[PDB]
Enzyme design. Structure first.
Site, PDB file in Angstrom:
ATOM      1  N   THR A 166       0.694  -1.092  -0.011  1.00  0.00           N
ATOM      2  CA  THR A 166      -0.064  -0.004   0.058  1.00  0.00           C
ATOM      3  C   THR A 166       0.871   1.318   0.005  1.00  0.00           C
ATOM      4  O   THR A 166       0.628   2.238  -0.937  1.00  0.00           O
ATOM      5  CB  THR A 166      -1.033   0.038   1.132  1.00  0.00           C
ATOM      6  OG1 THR A 166      -2.080  -1.147   1.139  1.00  0.00           O
ATOM      7  CG2 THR A 166      -1.646   1.263   1.143  1.00  0.00           C
ATOM      8  N   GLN A 182      -6.091  -1.814  -3.186  1.00  0.00           N
ATOM      9  CA  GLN A 182      -5.324  -0.724  -2.649  1.00  0.00           C
ATOM     10  C   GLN A 182      -4.466  -0.071  -3.623  1.00  0.00           C
ATOM     11  O   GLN A 182      -3.557  -0.760  -4.229  1.00  0.00           O
ATOM     12  CB  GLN A 182      -4.495  -1.012  -1.490  1.00  0.00           C
ATOM     13  CG  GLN A 182      -5.194  -1.305  -0.032  1.00  0.00           C
ATOM     14  CD  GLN A 182      -5.399  -2.901   0.112  1.00  0.00           C
ATOM     15  OE1 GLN A 182      -5.373  -3.704  -0.829  1.00  0.00           O
ATOM     16  NE2 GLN A 182      -5.165  -3.369   1.266  1.00  0.00           N
ATOM     17  N   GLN A 240      -9.883   2.406  -4.427  1.00  0.00           N
ATOM     18  CA  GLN A 240      -9.510   2.073  -3.041  1.00  0.00           C
ATOM     19  C   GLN A 240      -8.384   3.017  -2.565  1.00  0.00           C
ATOM     20  O   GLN A 240      -7.281   2.940  -3.154  1.00  0.00           O
ATOM     21  CB  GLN A 240      -9.544   0.802  -2.850  1.00  0.00           C
ATOM     22  CG  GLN A 240      -9.288   0.403  -1.460  1.00  0.00           C
ATOM     23  CD  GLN A 240      -9.335  -1.372  -1.042  1.00  0.00           C
ATOM     24  OE1 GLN A 240      -9.758  -1.963  -1.943  1.00  0.00           O
ATOM     25  NE2 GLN A 240      -8.890  -1.711   0.087  1.00  0.00           N
ATOM     26  N   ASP A 241      -8.455   3.488  -1.540  1.00  0.00           N
ATOM     27  CA  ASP A 241      -7.169   4.244  -0.690  1.00  0.00           C
ATOM     28  C   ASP A 241      -6.587   5.479  -1.567  1.00  0.00           C
ATOM     29  O   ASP A 241      -5.539   5.664  -1.656  1.00  0.00           O
ATOM     30  CB  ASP A 241      -6.096   3.260  -0.607  1.00  0.00           C
ATOM     31  CG  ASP A 241      -6.508   2.235   0.756  1.00  0.00           C
ATOM     32  OD1 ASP A 241      -7.568   2.271   1.151  1.00  0.00           O
ATOM     33  OD2 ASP A 241      -5.512   1.734   1.027  1.00  0.00           O
ATOM     34  N   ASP A 264     -12.443   3.420   1.795  1.00  0.00           N
ATOM     35  CA  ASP A 264     -11.374   4.060   2.634  1.00  0.00           C
ATOM     36  C   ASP A 264     -10.515   5.111   1.943  1.00  0.00           C
ATOM     37  O   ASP A 264      -9.441   5.215   2.043  1.00  0.00           O
ATOM     38  CB  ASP A 264     -10.432   3.106   3.171  1.00  0.00           C
ATOM     39  CG  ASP A 264     -11.198   1.849   3.979  1.00  0.00           C
ATOM     40  OD1 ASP A 264     -12.199   2.352   4.623  1.00  0.00           O
ATOM     41  OD2 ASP A 264     -10.589   1.093   4.207  1.00  0.00           O
ATOM     42  N   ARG A 296     -15.141   4.403   8.982  1.00  0.00           N
ATOM     43  CA  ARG A 296     -14.927   3.101   9.740  1.00  0.00           C
ATOM     44  C   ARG A 296     -13.580   3.336  10.552  1.00  0.00           C
ATOM     45  O   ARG A 296     -12.911   3.813  10.217  1.00  0.00           O
ATOM     46  CB  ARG A 296     -15.258   1.961   8.942  1.00  0.00           C
ATOM     47  CG  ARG A 296     -14.082   1.575   8.038  1.00  0.00           C
ATOM     48  CD  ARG A 296     -14.351   0.137   7.384  1.00  0.00           C
ATOM     49  NE  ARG A 296     -13.402  -0.062   6.215  1.00  0.00           N
ATOM     50  CZ  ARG A 296     -13.250  -1.182   5.508  1.00  0.00           C
ATOM     51  NH1 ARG A 296     -13.853  -2.192   5.982  1.00  0.00           N
ATOM     52  NH2 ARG A 296     -12.586  -1.318   4.499  1.00  0.00           N
ATOM     53  N   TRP A 332     -10.505   2.358  11.777  1.00  0.00           N
ATOM     54  CA  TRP A 332      -9.069   1.328  11.344  1.00  0.00           C
ATOM     55  C   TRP A 332      -8.374   1.044  12.528  1.00  0.00           C
ATOM     56  O   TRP A 332      -7.880  -0.141  12.875  1.00  0.00           O
ATOM     57  CB  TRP A 332      -8.345   1.987  10.227  1.00  0.00           C
ATOM     58  CG  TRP A 332      -7.213   1.200   9.849  1.00  0.00           C
ATOM     59  CD1 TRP A 332      -7.042  -0.024   9.807  1.00  0.00           C
ATOM     60  CD2 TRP A 332      -5.897   1.917   9.149  1.00  0.00           C
ATOM     61  NE1 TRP A 332      -5.876  -0.364   9.238  1.00  0.00           N
ATOM     62  CE2 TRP A 332      -5.127   0.885   8.817  1.00  0.00           C
ATOM     63  CE3 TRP A 332      -5.747   3.196   8.778  1.00  0.00           C
ATOM     64  CZ2 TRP A 332      -3.927   1.143   8.213  1.00  0.00           C
ATOM     65  CZ3 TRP A 332      -4.444   3.329   8.145  1.00  0.00           C
ATOM     66  CH2 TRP A 332      -3.614   2.464   7.801  1.00  0.00           C
TER      67      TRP A 332
HETATM   68  C1  CAC Z   1      -6.804  -1.712   5.404  1.00  0.00           C
HETATM   69 AS1  CAC Z   1      -6.961  -0.122   4.331  1.00  0.00          AS
HETATM   70  C2  CAC Z   1      -7.094   1.435   5.486  1.00  0.00           C
HETATM   71  O1  CAC Z   1      -5.442   0.171   3.442  1.00  0.00           O
HETATM   72  O2  CAC Z   1      -7.921  -0.197   3.284  1.00  0.00           O
END
Ligand code: CAC
Ligand code: CAC
Length: 319
Positions: free
Chosen positions: A83, A113, A135-136, A157, A225, A227
């Site tokens: 990530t 991610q 995502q991210d 997220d 949410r 984390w």
């Molecule tokens: C587990 As996450 C905050 O990288 O989507």
């Protein structure tokens, strides 16, 4: 053909400038500088990953327009990256600034991610920038940050991390995700009650993109949410459309963090701002005191009176 904020070098994809890529300009900047080094980036599309390390301080990106100057890439976790390392642009050196430009990651919903912009620079700011992904999208990793009149889009997220950040007068839109997925605007990760971190959205506009609006009833969207155990997020003085489910917030894993987190809302407006159907958690709260809300404004949350003026961008310190 003109000079506003003192420009040290010019980047141009069409070959009319000093260098063809953004990475070349960052490499040319000297380390440990007390003065600002400005990089002008002309219209075009730049396919590259860019890194601004810890020793390159006070660097500024000055594009020719959010709509015409694009930095793009597609690293992701599904294909093998972490990530942290998937970011198209990573700004770490202290005092980073950027205006009139786009940062994007084109991997897609099915790749999990995939970060567009990661920030770990203390006293950094962004004006009239677009940050786009799924995502991210935006990794607000660490230290003090400020975003003004920016547009951020994503799905799962899409604004996450453990920095101390305030997003003021911004446009934040959720887009259509993959089959069976649920959108989450934020995922704040504070792990200790003595850490001075959190995510604050003030005087902004939260809504949906054109491809999500018609089918909101098929893809639920929440404000966030938890984390980590001491997650802290605040939404105030903003307009919210019905894209947000009445519950407002979503659990991470059962009863994890529900008694220790701090999620608050102060004087918002719009169909999605109703609070009568919100979750019953001990950590959720409708703020009715102005002194409590003021603590989350720029002047009090990120020491804004000491550095925002010097960014050359617009700002407001209080309520
Ligand atoms: C587990 As996450 C905050 O990288 O989507
Ligand atoms: C002649 As020129 C440096 O403005 O393209």
């Amino acid at each position: 053909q003109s000079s506003t904020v003192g420009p040290n070098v010019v980047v141009a994809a069409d070959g009319s400038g000093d260098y063809k890529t953004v990475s070349e300009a960052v490499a040319a900047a000297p380390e440990d500088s007390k003065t600002r080094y400005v990089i002008r980036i002309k219209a075009g599309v730049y396919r590259e990953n860019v890194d601004v390390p810890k020793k390159k301080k006070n660097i500024m990106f000055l594009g020719d327009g959010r709509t015409s100057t694009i930095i793009t890439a597609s690293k992701n976790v599904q294909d093998g990256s972490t990530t942290f390392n998937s970011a198209t642009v990573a700004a770490v050196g202290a005092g980073f600034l950027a205006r009139d430009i786009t940062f994007q990651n084109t991997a897609g919903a099915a790749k999990h991610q995939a970060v567009a912009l990661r920030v770990g620079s203390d006293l950094s700011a962004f004006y009239r920038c677009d940050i786009l992904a799924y995502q991210d999208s935006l990794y607000v990793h660490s230290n003090r940050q400020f975003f003004i009149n920016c547009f951020i889009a994503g799905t799962v997220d899409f604004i996450f991390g453990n920095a101390a950040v305030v997003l003021q007068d911004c446009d934040i839109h959720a887009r259509r995700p993959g089959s069976g997925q649920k959108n989450m605007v934020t995922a704040q990760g504070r792990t200790d009650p003595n850490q001075n971190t959190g995510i604050v959205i003030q005087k902004s506009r939260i809504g949906a993109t054109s491809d999500l609006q018609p089918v909101q009833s098929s893809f639920p969207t929440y404000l966030g949410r938890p984390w980590k155990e001491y997650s802290r997020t605040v939404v105030m003085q903003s307009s919210i459309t019905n894209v947000i489910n009445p519950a407002g917030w979503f659990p991470w894993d059962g009863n994890f963090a529900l008694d220790t987190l701090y999620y608050g809302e102060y004087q918002n407006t719009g169909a999605g701002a109703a609070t009568s159907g919100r979750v019953t958690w001990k950590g959720f709260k409708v703020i009715t005191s102005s002194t409590e809300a003021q603590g989350f404004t720029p002047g009090s949350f990120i020491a804004g009176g000491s550095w925002l003026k010097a960014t050359t961008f617009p700002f407001s310190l209080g309520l």
